[PDB]
């Protein structure tokens, strides 16, 4: 199938309560593989997947060097952003960053990303052409001009098309037994009597990887788009995911309802009835 690699990082100022915290995380698809926490004692990029552990001490040294320098850069970036906005130093602020690449099943480059958010809102983003920036406001427009004058886009193009796809490919091969798997959902319905004239039907999906899935309710062939409670896809903690969709049902009307389930691990969509 097609795959992705992402790195996410968050710097948060902790005014009066210490120096900014930096946390970076690396994913291949819905699987985490590395982490760096500035607060941790280790002060190193650390393994988070069995298949990354095989990388020699050189990898861990370089990765540590790159993430530490990024940590310190983002600490100055918070100070720059405070200045751009004339914000009080009493306030706590967050810079988030995401970068990485998509590849196809044959391993070819499909898409590159390199984008920032300041205080949970878009700041600057590399456009799909990997040649220009989308700046969200006047402060980001200032950053954008500095980045145009410095040819930063060209550095990111070269990383996203180069090191990023090479790394993703190596990880996908080394972690083939895990990454290349697609665990279809174990599905079931439950019934919970509420009152006299009502009960909840709940449709479960358990133990699926990857996280993408669709769950849908119908009352005899017709969709039930607005009476369905649908929770967020949540991690089971073991590599897999869970989700449920529920509808409230008039007593004696359970037979009218069907649950519908779509996942890439499923040759054909499941239908469930009580």
């Amino acid at each position: 199938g097609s795959h992705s690699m992402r790195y996410f990082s968050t710097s948060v100022s902790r005014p009066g309560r210490g120096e900014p915290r930096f946390i970076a995380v690396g994913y291949v698809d819905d699987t985490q593989f590395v982490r760096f926490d500035s607060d941790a004692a280790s002060q190193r990029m650390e393994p988070r997947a069995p298949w990354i552990e095989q990388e020699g001490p050189e990898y861990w040294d370089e990765e540590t060097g790159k993430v530490k320098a990024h940590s310190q850069t983002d600490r100055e970036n918070l100070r720059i952003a405070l200045r751009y906005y004339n914000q009080s130093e009493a306030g706590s602020h967050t810079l988030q960053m995401m970068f990485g690449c998509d590849v196809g099943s044959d391993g070819r480059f499909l898409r590159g990303y390199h984008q920032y958010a300041y205080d949970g809102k878009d700041y600057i983003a590399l456009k799909e052409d990997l040649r220009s920036w989308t700046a969200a406001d006047m402060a980001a427009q200032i950053t954008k001009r500095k980045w145009e004058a410095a040819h930063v886009a060209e550095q990111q193009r070269a990383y996203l098309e180069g090191t990023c796809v090479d790394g993703l490919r190596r990880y996908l091969e080394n972690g083939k037994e895990t990454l290349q798997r697609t665990d279809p959902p174990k599905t079931h319905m439950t019934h919970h009597p509420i009152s006299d004239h009502e009960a909840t039907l709940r449709c479960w999906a358990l133990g699926f990887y990857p996280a993408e899935i669709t769950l849908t309710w119908q009352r005899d062939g017709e969709d039930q788009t607005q009476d369905t409670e649908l929770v967020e896809t949540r991690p089971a903690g073991d590599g897999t995911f869970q989700k449920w969709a529920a509808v409230v049902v008039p007593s004696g009307e359970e037979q009218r309802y069907t649950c519908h389930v779509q996942h890439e691990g499923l040759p054909k969509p499941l239908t469930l009835r009580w």
Binding site: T10, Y27, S92, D122, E232, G237, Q242
Partner: protein, 100 residues
């Protein structure tokens, strides 16, 4: 800059079975800022040694974390998740419901 209230789900890794050792999870998601407090409770009292995933975020930039602990469910023992955040007026306690 706007803030977003955590969404909270307390659940077990595998379907609950009394006497079978399991994992209790508390998933907090959709929140901003990242400053948060999360605890799993056993009979109204805070569990120690609780672990959590490394801070990460969704496409809308909002954060998520998994807080978890090994446990053996029993019919009498109650479990809960306690969350505190800027957006909350008081700590939020969400009780573990085997069915949800």
């Amino acid at each position: 800059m706007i803030q977003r209230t955590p969404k909270i789900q307390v659940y077990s890794r595998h379907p609950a079975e009394n006497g079978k050792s399991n994992f209790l999870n508390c998933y907090v998601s959709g929140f901003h800022p990242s400053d948060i407090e999360v605890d799993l409770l056993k009979n109204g009292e805070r569990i120690e040694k609780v672990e959590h995933s490394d801070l990460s975020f969704s496409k809308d930039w909002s954060f998520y974390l998994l807080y978890y602990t090994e446990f053996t469910p029993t019919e009498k023992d109650e479990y809960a998740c306690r969350v505190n955040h800027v957006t909350l007026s008081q700590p939020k306690i969400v009780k573990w419901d085997r069915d949800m």
